[PDB]
Amino acid sequence: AQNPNCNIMIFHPTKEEFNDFDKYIAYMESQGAHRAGLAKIIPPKEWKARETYDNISEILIATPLQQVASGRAGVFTQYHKKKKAMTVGEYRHLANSKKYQTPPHQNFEDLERKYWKNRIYNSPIYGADISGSLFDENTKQWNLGHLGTIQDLLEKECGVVIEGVNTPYLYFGMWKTTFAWHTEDMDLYSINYLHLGEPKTWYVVPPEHGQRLERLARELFPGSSRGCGAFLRHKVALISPTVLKENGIPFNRITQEAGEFMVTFPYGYHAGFNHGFNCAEAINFATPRWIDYGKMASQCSCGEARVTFSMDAFVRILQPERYDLWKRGQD
Numbered sequence: 001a002q003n004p005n006c007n008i009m010i011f012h013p014t015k016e017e018f019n020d021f022d023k024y025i026a027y028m029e030s031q032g033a034h035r036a037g038l039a040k041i042i043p044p045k046e047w048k049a050r051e052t053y054d055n056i057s058e059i060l061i062a063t064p065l066q067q068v069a070s071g072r073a074g075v076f077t078q079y080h081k082k083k084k085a086m087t088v089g090e091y092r093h094l095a096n097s098k099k100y101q102t103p104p105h106q107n108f109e110d111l112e113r114k115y116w117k118n119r120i121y122n123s124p125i126y127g128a129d130i131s132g133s134l135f136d137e138n139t140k141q142w143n144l145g146h147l148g149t150i151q152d153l154l155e156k157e158c159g160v161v162i163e164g165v166n167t168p169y170l171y172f173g174m175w176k177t178t179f180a181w182h183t184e185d186m187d188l189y190s191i192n193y194l195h196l197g198e199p200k201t202w203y204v205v206p207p208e209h210g211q212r213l214e215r216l217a218r219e220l221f222p223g224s225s226r227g228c229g230a231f232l233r234h235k236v237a238l239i240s241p242t243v244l245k246e247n248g249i250p251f252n253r254i255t256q257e258a259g260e261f262m263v264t265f266p267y268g269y270h271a272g273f274n275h276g277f278n279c280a281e282a283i284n285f286a287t288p289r290w291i292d293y294g295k296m297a298s299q300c301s302c303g304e305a306r307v308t309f310s311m312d313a314f315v316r317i318l319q320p321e322r323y324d325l326w327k328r329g330q331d
């Protein structure tokens with residue numbers, strides 16, 4: 001067995017190895033990388049996503065979300081309060097203002113400590129799920145807007161043609177900006193590129209113990225657990241590293257810096273926070289190994305998760321039994 005520890009592996013591909021995305025994902029997994037639930041990929045030194053970031057100020061964040069917490073410091077949910085539209089330029093100014101700027105601190109460990117101690121007391125504003133791409137049209141490798149689609153992957157493995165297309169999303173963050181504990185829709189892979197700015201800290205549970213995390217979340221959020229058999233789909237729940245330790249939940253942490261890719265693996269629960277103003281780009285993807293995870297993936301039918309048009313066909317083909325009930329939760 002490779003990576004028997006499920007530790008997070010960091011990859012440094014050559015120019016040549018960076019030329020075939022699917023090949024390199026398969027190579028990572030041949031080394032056991034998927035066992036951690038997250039891997040880091042450092043692009044080759046000659047690679048760039050694009051020339052500069054000088055001209056991104058006019059991008060509109062149509063619906064900035066203020067992330068308001070309830071609970072206690074290490075066990076809370078957050079809700080998203082919609083704010084008025086702003087440009088990236090305005091958002092960056094707001095991130096850097098006294099009220100929201102990264103505090104003075106020693107190192108990453110000092111910031112992590114301040115995050116879990118103080119996060120619930122503030123409500124930072126983040127620009128999430130903005131359809132779009134910052135990759136230069138001419139960047140040929142690891143261009144997140146040029147990956148093969150999940151619809152074509154499904155077709156190629158199952159021989160069925162389906163509607164839908166998938167496209168990247170941009171995320172503009174600031175200090176304390178928070179991504180709640182979750183796996184991807186249909187337990188897909190994701191890949192995340194940090195274009196610019198301050199770091200992102202990730203926490204991840206190995207896929208082989210995602211059920212343990214679900215069990216703890218049901219003990220920690222009893223009210224949300226009753227409302228829904230798949231409530232982590234709602235993406236509202238936070239549980240600190242200290243609470244995970246106390247509860248025997250295996251996990252790992254890693255900090256992503258600008259210029260680096262993160263890959264999450266099927267059914268790898270992850271959560272995290274941003275160190276300060278940054279911009280990340282992300283997309284889901286599939287490989288033949290995902291198919292079996294997609295067939296077993298849990299579904300919110302609470303209403304709450306309210307997903308995307310593109311998911312309909314995945315539930316339809318991979319989970320025909322679950323489809324009617326899912327479809328009605330969608331209304």
Ligand SMILES: O=C(O)CNC(=O)C(=O)O
Nearest residue numbers: 171179190192264280282
């Ligand atoms: O933009 C972010 O940092 C949030 N991303 C993810 O959860 C992901 O790519 O899986």
Ligand SMILES: [Fe+2]
Nearest residue numbers: 183184190270
């Ligand atoms: Fe994610």
